[PDB]
Design a protein around this ligand. Structure first.
Ligand SMILES: Nc1ncnc2c1ncn2[C@@H]1O[C@H](COP(=O)(O)OP(=O)(O)OP(=O)(O)O)[C@@H](O)[C@H]1O
Ligand SMILES: N#Cc1ccccc1CSc1nc2c(=O)nc(N)[nH]c2[nH]1
Ligand SMILES: [Ca+2]
Ligand SMILES: [Ca+2]
Ligand SMILES: [Ca+2]
Ligand SMILES: [Ca+2]
Length: 155
């Protein structure tokens, strides 16, 4: 079966997160039937949320894969857990896009339900996929031209 390009958001806001992120990239690259095509720059983003916490390291990866979408989710969940993610964050791997697919299942909603509202997703995505068009036809470039998002600082 043909390869699909999936786009995965990476976040960590450990007080020291660069090692989580680099370990995640290595793990993502070892996923079967999959290969990293591109990685964005790393960005330092102020934390969104009510609690006092460290800044996030945010990034995006393009992963070419012939896995089924839920199978890719199995791997991203395994990586988060194997890197010490404990639910009450060490690592967060969100599947933003899985080619052109629109998925609404119990475990998996693609496109990511809020990504069009998140500069820390859209800017890294634009760096690696400037010509991207969403499944509904919206162009990434047009969203970033029109809507107000802060620019990100590099990590
Ligand atoms: N596109 C997706 N990528 C990753 N997980 C997803 C996706 N869609 C649904 N899920 C499901 O989301 C559940 C909750 O994950 P999580 O607690 O990481 O949310 P979050 O990343 O903190 O918040 P947000 O989604 O608003 O960024 C997972 O158990 C997983 O089954
Ligand atoms: N509440 C909350 C909330 C508010 C906006 C977006 C996402 C969340 C969900 S938790 C969260 N994740 C990240 C991240 O990856 N990067 C930054 N900068 N802030 C973050 N907050
Ligand atoms: Ca998540
Ligand atoms: Ca998230
Ligand atoms: Ca919002
Ligand atoms: Ca869409």
């Amino acid at each position: 079966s043909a390869m699909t390009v999936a786009y995965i958001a990476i976040g960590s806001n450990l007080a020291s997160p660069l090692e989580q992120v680099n370990a995640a990239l290595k793990a993502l690259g070892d996923i079967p039937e999959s290969h990293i095509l591109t990685v964005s720059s790393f960005y330092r983003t102020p934390p969104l949320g009510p609690q006092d916490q460290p800044d996030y390291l945010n990034a995006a990866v393009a992963l070419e894969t012939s896995l089924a979408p839920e199978e890719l989710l199995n791997h991203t969940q395994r990586i988060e857990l194997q890197q010490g993610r404990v639910r009450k964050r060490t690592l967060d791997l969100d599947i933003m896009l899985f080619g052109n697919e629109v998925i609404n299942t119990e475990r998996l909603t693609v496109p990511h339900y809020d990504m069009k509202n998140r500069g820390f997703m859209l800017w890294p995505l634009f760096e690696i996929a400037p010509e991207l068009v969403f499944p509904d036809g919206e162009m990434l470039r047009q969203i970033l031209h029109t809507r107000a998002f802060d620019k990100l600082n590099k990590w």
